[PDB]
Amino acid sequence: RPRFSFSIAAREGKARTGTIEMKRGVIRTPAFMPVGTAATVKALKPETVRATGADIILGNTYHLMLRPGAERIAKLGGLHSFMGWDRPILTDSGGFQVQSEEGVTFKSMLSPERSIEIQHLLGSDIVMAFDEVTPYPATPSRAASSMERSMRWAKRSRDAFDSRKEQAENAALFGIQQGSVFENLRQQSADALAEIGFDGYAVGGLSEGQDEMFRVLDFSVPMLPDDKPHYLMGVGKPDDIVGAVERGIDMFDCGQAFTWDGPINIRNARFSEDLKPLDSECHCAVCQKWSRAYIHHLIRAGEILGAMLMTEHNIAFYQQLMQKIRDSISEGRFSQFAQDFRARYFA
Amino acid sequence: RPRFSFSIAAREGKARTGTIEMKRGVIRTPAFMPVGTAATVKALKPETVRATGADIILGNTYHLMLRPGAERIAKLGGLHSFMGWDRPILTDSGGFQVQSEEGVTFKSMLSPERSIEIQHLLGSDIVMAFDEVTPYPATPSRAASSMERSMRWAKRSRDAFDSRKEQAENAALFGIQQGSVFENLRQQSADALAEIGFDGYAVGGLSEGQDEMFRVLDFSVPMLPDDKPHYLMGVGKPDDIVGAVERGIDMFDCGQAFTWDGPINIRNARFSEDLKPLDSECHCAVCQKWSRAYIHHLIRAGEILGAMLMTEHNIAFYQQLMQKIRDSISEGRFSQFAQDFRARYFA
Ligand SMILES: CC(C)(C)OC(=O)NCc1c[nH]c2nc(N)[nH]c(=O)c12
Ligand SMILES: CC(C)(C)OC(=O)NCc1c[nH]c2nc(N)[nH]c(=O)c12
Ligand SMILES: [Zn+2]
Ligand SMILES: [Zn+2]
């Protein structure tokens, strides 16, 4: 396998389905990435993460640099080895969880250079440029100043990554579009990132309300290079994913249980004697073996197994959603799927 | 399979190894029973419990009657179905976790009759008689009065169980010896229980210090019927198990990680960069896949996966201990095993 190759197999309107091939594995797109906050996907063994269908997970640079530490993880062999996940890992840059033109110092430093270095020490497969994330709402002046700094930092990120031969040869680098909700700033940002050149392009700064997010995506995603993956950071509700895919997004990150009829809160007393599985159609191991009543009990009792079973179901639901999206786009029936999904999820 | 059959395959001194056959499965003795406090073995799926070698688990009548409730579990199909463990389950009576000759009332009633009924509603395979547990230390007068009440309650337990045909036909009933540390009271209690007749006999009221416990076991276990299982309640340190087996016990219940060189506390900073598994010889899935350094990180970070991995290792260590005990007794080399175990565990 190559360092990085994105192939589009099928399209429907702005929606795409395809594959990212990398040295550690293939990523089916559109993709949902479980989040491994402190070198673990909460309450799941990596083998269980994989069994839900996940092709890639996300690691948080901010949290790992604080505990257990990036240099420590490198000395122990890198994040993949440390946590026992051997497939691709995307790391964020830290711009959300964390000031001057050099970078930021904080109490528990980060800069374009140090962020890229940390992601190298972790052994990330997909590295994110270090950005300045613009609060919402933002005045046009502030959004502009902030986007411009982020594009300067994107070039510094690019140069840092490229200066590290092992990283340049084995990992990919994504740039992050900024500009708040303003079309001209999003265009300027897209142009700047494309001039620098990246392996993929994230839409940052969103996640305001859904209508507003979708309006910004309507004009922002077509600005990005068509032939590279489009990653919407920080957006994970099922409905938000469906509409973002309809607007050209390829990648997403991560008592409430998801069902095809909408979310339920399993702690509600109505579930105390309900022998049905969490969802009627879900193929996951939890829905095969345990009732709503049992999981209700476990979560109300504070038992770790309740967290384990709820998280495995929810991740498996997300991966089933992504599979249904991929198949419907490849079959040219994604519009119909989106309509059917919503009429039931919100019935 | 029969309702209940205990067979002794091999002996060495007072130690025995054999099998209890029951309708839901075979129990290899000497046996260690993981504890399922609120209808779950902490942080483990039942399939993971089984993969460690466990043949039987323990459920706590006190806790289940409070949450989710015994009548509720029966309406949902019984404890086996509710939690997804299809092998034997032993339930305690509640005499430890919880006054008059009728029973006890408390704030979050129990009596011999209601305890047996609760265990029936849960669908327990091995039911414990309801006892009065004697505090330690106890004066001879108090220990005697208390033991006598427990023997009256043992007869009421026997009569309650037998009056329930489905329970009598499908479950087993164990009696509990009392008498504190006094040889004459332990003898009186053994005699009373044998006159009533049970499928197995527990030594209650112990777990004071190890020397004292072992002295009491020296004279108390030979008093119990030889041809039935001997269960020491509430005693679970590895050293305590080895010496209790040497005195004729067959059954036991459940940051610290067990190793063959002694326990370690994985939170200690000395483990922060230790790439070795928890134990050098352990065959468990955790020791095959993850380092001390990773588990150190997880436990210090409060992550659920740390609890999951520590518990699976510890239970697997206990089951490996029990297997080594069983094999050594069957091979007539248990004395040597006990000596070798201690010289290393305490090196
Ligand atoms: C809170 C607001 C709406 C201002 O930003 C976002 O929602 N931002 C989304 C986001 C999530 N993770 C990110 N990592 C980086 N590097 N940059 C980002 O913009 C983001
Ligand atoms: C605290 C002292 C030493 C007084 O008792 C014990 O250690 N007792 C051990 C024990 C554990 N679980 C039990 N369940 C019941 N029904 N009866 C018991 O005696 C016990
Ligand atoms: Zn499910
Ligand atoms: Zn182990």
Author numbering:
A (entry chain A), B (entry chain A): 11 to 108, 117 to 126, 134 to 232, 235 to 281, 291 to 383
Paper text:
Transfer RNA–guanine transglycosylase (Tgt, EC 2.4.2.29) catalyses the exchange of a specific guanine base in tRNA molecules by a substituted 7-deazaguanine. The reaction follows a ping-pong mechanism including a covalent Tgt⋅tRNA intermediate. Hence, in an attempt to generate a model system for the active site of human Tgt and to gain insights into the relevance of particular amino acids for substrate base selectivity, we adapted the Z. mobilis Tgt active site by site-directed mutagenesis in order to mimic that of the human enzyme.
Nucleobase mimetics endowed with bulky exocyclic substituents, however, generally constitute purely competitive inhibitors with respect to tRNA as their binding to the covalent Tgt·tRNA complex would sterically interfere with the tRNA sugar phosphate backbone.
